[PDB]
Every structure is written in structure tokens, then in C-alpha cells.
């Protein structure tokens, strides 16, 4: 289960770290950040 | 070559025809879409990928092709996107255009004509299935 | 062998019309979500299908959309005969249900499910190309 | 070769493939099974087979 978040006009893919109640902590390049849950969709792979 | 495709937008009659060429075989898929958006491009790509083993897609810097919706589709399915028979299609559409009311009908007619045509010496429709089949 | 035999069906889901083509021999699927259950839409579908696969025969029900003159026209033009098991259709519904929440739009879920179905293993996606290929090559 | 689909009333339904006999400015003469029929050009869809 490899998950990809596209975040906040959209940005991604960024690598899933932790998803919590109202936000998800994520990073791609080096910049770790936290975005509120609902506008940072998480779609897996096949 | 098996799994290498090219994606392009033609504009015609203030409409957006989206075209996929399987580079190896010359085979075509096309769809007339309401807007030149990344959403529409991506939904196209999903349909394409569910039907063919598509590994790599060549596109231009089109805002619709550099759109994340498209990026998302690619990552989800298997597809690498590169940025670094189309002209024939336009010709055929022109030829058949008056035979049908709607441009979309003319486009699909032209696709059919193109894929089924031979050089008597196989058709593109045949070449693609042959290629994919011999692969696996 | 039946390389040219297909089946056409309409499912309703979330007050929308999914149109489904099954290549009977291989179990392979194409689907499109359409705005209306019309003969125009059905026929335009059939054209797309026929330009992509060697389609000899299409199995359908007495659906007004399938008995429509637009569909008949498409068939005559492309040289498809129209005739008047459905586990690949019911399986498709199942998979859509499974993946439904993964995507916003039903259409996205449908195409996801088609992809899942054709690629699952060997696979229907492989069987069809194999079948059509062996028919051209022999 | 050429197939004519036509409306031979207000519009119950387009009528099936009929043979083109003659096409003129304002009308088309077609044969549907045994029956010669005349419809306005504007009520006639004429499609050439692939
Ligand atoms: C609305 C959206 N909005 C988006 C905004 C940003 C990024 C992707 C989307 C995506 C998206 C893109 C690619 C995918 C998706 C998958 C599941 C869910 N959404 C998507 C699996 C297949 O590949 C989507 C999806 O819709 C489109 C297909 C019209 C783009 C969706 O219905 O969620
Ligand atoms: C609008 C229409 N209206 C119609 C009304 C009655 C009968 C056919 C149509 C046809 C028609 C149907 C099937 C075909 C056609 C072809 C050429 C031209 N028209 C059609 C070749 C492939 O198969 C069509 C075509 O449109 C649909 C495909 C959306 C129905 C068209 O654009 O002419």
C-alpha cells in the first residue's frame, strides 16, 4: 500500500508520513509540512 | 516501443480533439472533449491505460498535460511521463467531415478508417495487437 | 474463438448510466458513463469500440437505445451484425463499489474498476490481445 | 452502398436502411423493401457504408 498525497492550485505527489484527525504530515523534496486533512487527497497506487 | 505512446490536442471547430498514438504500430485513439483541461486529459489517460499496457507517455508542455490530475493518473497507473499519423488523421477528418453532422462522429469515423487501412502490409489495428501479443 | 463477438449493456448507478462492452471470449471490458440512455450515445460508443477492435457481432437486449436507428446505422456502416454470461458485468459493479470512495467522481471509479478488472490475473487484457492476434496471424 | 434513414411523418422514429434511387435538391426517392417512397432531403440521412 503506497500512498500519494496531492495537497494545498494542487501540489503532488508527496510522500505519506502520518495522517491525523484534522491534518496530514508529508514531504517530497525535503520540506516537511502539515496540511489540513480534506484538501490534501490521498490516492494509493494499483 | 511496446508501451510507448504520444498524446496530442488538436483544435477544430472550436472543439478539442484529444489523440493518443501508439508510436510503434501507428494506432490511434481519439476523443472530443468539452474543455482542454487536465481533468479531461487525465480521465482520457485512465481509459487508455485500462485498455493497453502503457508504460510511457510523450506530451508537450500543455498546461493540460503538465496538470497534476494527469500526474496523479500517471502515478496511479504505471505511467512515466516524458516531455522531451496525427497529420494524416486531420486529413481524413476533413475528407469525411461532411458525411456526418457532429464533428465527434467524423473524428471516430476517421479513426476507424485510419486503424483499419492497410498497405497491401498490415493495418495499424493489427500491428498493435500483434506487438502487444508478442510482448507480455 | 468468437474474436469478433461482443455484448453491450446499460447499468444504472448513482442516477447515472454506465454503458458496458464485454468481449465475450476474453472477458475484457470497456465502459463509459453517458449523460442519457439514448441511441445516439449508444451508437457513438459503438463507433469508438469498432474503430479499436475487429467487431463482427454485437449482442444486446430490446433496449429502446439498442433498437434505435442510430445504432442500426452505426452497425451497417461498420459491418457489425446485431443480435437480440453476464458475470463480467456483475463483477464490474462489485469492483466499482470497492473502489468507489477512492475517487470523487463515479466516472473515475468506473474507469479505475475497468482497469483493475482487465489487469487482474492470465488477465483479460492479455487474453483479448492474444485472441485477436492469433486470429490475424493464423 | 448508400443507406438512407428517413422520417416519413412528423417523427415517430427514423426508419431503417432504405436504398437510394435518386437524390434531388428538395427530395429523395428511396426504396424501402418493395416500396418506393419520397421524402424531403431535409428528412433524410444518407450514409455511405465503410
Ligand atoms: C476530482 C479529482 N481531483 C484531483 C485533484 C488533484 C489530483 C488528482 C485528482 C483526481 C484524480 C486524478 C487521477 C487519479 C485519481 C484516482 C482517484 C481519485 N482521484 C484521482 C486514481 C486514478 O488516478 C480527481 C478524480 O477525478 C479526475 C479523474 C476527473 C481527475 C476524482 O474523481 O477524484
Ligand atoms: C447525428 C446523427 N443522426 C443520425 C440519425 C439517423 C441515423 C444516423 C444518424 C447518425 C449516424 C449514426 C451512426 C453512424 C453515422 C455515420 C455517419 C453519419 N451519421 C451517422 C457513420 C457511422 O455510423 C448521426 C451521427 O451522430 C451520432 C453518431 C451521434 C448518432 C452524426 O453525427 O451524423
Minimal-distance CA residue to ligand 1 atom 23: B73
Handedness of CA C25, D50, B16, D5 (dihedral sign): negative
Give the bridge partners for C29, in sequence order.
C22
Give the CA dihedral B97, B101, B102, B108, nearest 10 degrees.
-50
Q: In which element (H, E) is residue C116 found? A: helix C106-119
**Strands ordered across the beta sheet of D27-32:** D35-40, D27-32, D15-24, D2-6, D44-48
Q: After which residues is chain B broken (C to N over 2.5 A)?
A: 84, 120
We find that the CATH architecture of domain A4-43 is Roll (2.30)
Are residues A4 and B72, on separate chains, in Cβ contact within 8 Å? yes
C16 C-alpha to center of ligand 2: Å?
Answer: 23
CB count within 10 Å of CB B87 equals: 7
- Put simply, the chain A residues between 3 and 42 with a CB less than 8 A from any chain B CB are 4, 6, 10-13
> Which three three-digit cell numbers place residue B47?
481509459
The preferred substitution site among C74, C76, C80, C82 for testing ligand 2, maximizing ligand atoms within 8 Å of CB, is C74
Instruction: State how far the Cα of C111 lies from the Cα of C92, in Å rounded to an integer.
Output: 10
CB count within 10 Å of CB A1 equals: 5
Q: Looking at residue B97, what DSSP letter applies?
A: G
Phi, psi for B16 (deg, rounded to 5):
-115, 110
Checking DSSP bridges between strand B56-58 and strand B4-12, what pairing results, if any? parallel
Please state which CATH number belongs to domain C5-137: 3.30.420.10
Give the bridge partners for A34, in sequence order.
A25
HSE-up of residue A18 (Cα within 13 Å, Cβ side): 7
Say which CATH class B4-134 falls into.
Answer: alpha beta
Domain parsing of chain A, residue ranges: 4-43
Phi, psi for B110 (deg, rounded to 5):
-65, -40
The preferred substitution site among B35, B66, B71, B72 for testing ligand 1, maximizing ligand atoms within 8 Å of CB, is B72
Contact residues, chain C, for D50 at CB < 8 Å: 77-79
Decide: helix, strand or coil at residue C15.
coil
Residue with cell 473524428: B107
Decide: helix, strand or coil at residue C120.
coil
Question: From 2.30.30.10, 3.90.1210.10, 3.40.228.10, 3.30.1600.10, which CATH number describes the D2-48 domain?
Answer: 2.30.30.10
> Which three three-digit cell numbers place residue D15?
426508419
Asked whether C108 and B73 are in contact (CB, 8 A), the reply is no
- Put simply, the chain B residues between 26 and 85 with a CB less than 8 A from any chain C CB are 29, 31, 43, 46-47, 49-53, 77
Q: Looking at residue B127, what DSSP letter applies?
A: H
Residue with cell 496530514: A24
Amino acid at each position: 500500500q503506497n500512498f500519494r498525497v496531492y495537497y494545498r492550485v494542487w501540489k503532488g505527489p508527496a510522500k505519506l508520513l502520518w495522517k491525523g484527525e484534522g491534518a496530514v504530515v508529508i514531504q517530497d523534496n525535503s520540506d516537511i509540512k502539515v496540511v489540513p486533512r480534506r484538501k490534501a487527497k490521498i490516492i494509493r497506487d494499483y | 516501443s511496446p508501451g510507448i505512446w504520444q498524446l496530442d490536442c488538436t483544435h477544430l471547430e472550436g472543439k478539442v480533439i484529444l489523440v493518443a498514438v501508439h508510436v510503434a504500430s501507428g494506432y490511434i485513439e481519439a476523443e472530443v472533449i468539452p474543455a482542454e483541461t487536465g481533468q479531461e486529459t487525465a480521465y482520457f489517460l485512465l481509459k487508455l491505460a485500462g485498455r493497453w499496457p502503457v508504460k510511457t507517455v510523450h506530451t508537450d508542455n500543455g498546461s493540460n498535460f503538465t496538470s497534476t490530475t494527469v500526474k496523479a493518473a500517471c502515478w496511479w497507473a504505471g505511467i512515466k511521463q516524458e516531455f522531451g499519423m496525427n497529420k494524416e488523421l486531420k486529413k481524413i477528418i476533413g475528407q469525411v467531415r461532411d458525411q456526418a453532422e457532429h464533428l465527434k462522429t467524423a473524428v471516430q469515423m476517421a479513426v476507424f478508417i485510419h486503424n483499419k487501412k492497410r498497405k497491401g502490409g498490415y493495418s495499424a489495428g493489427e500491428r498493435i495487437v500483434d506487438i502487444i501479443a508478442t510482448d507480455i
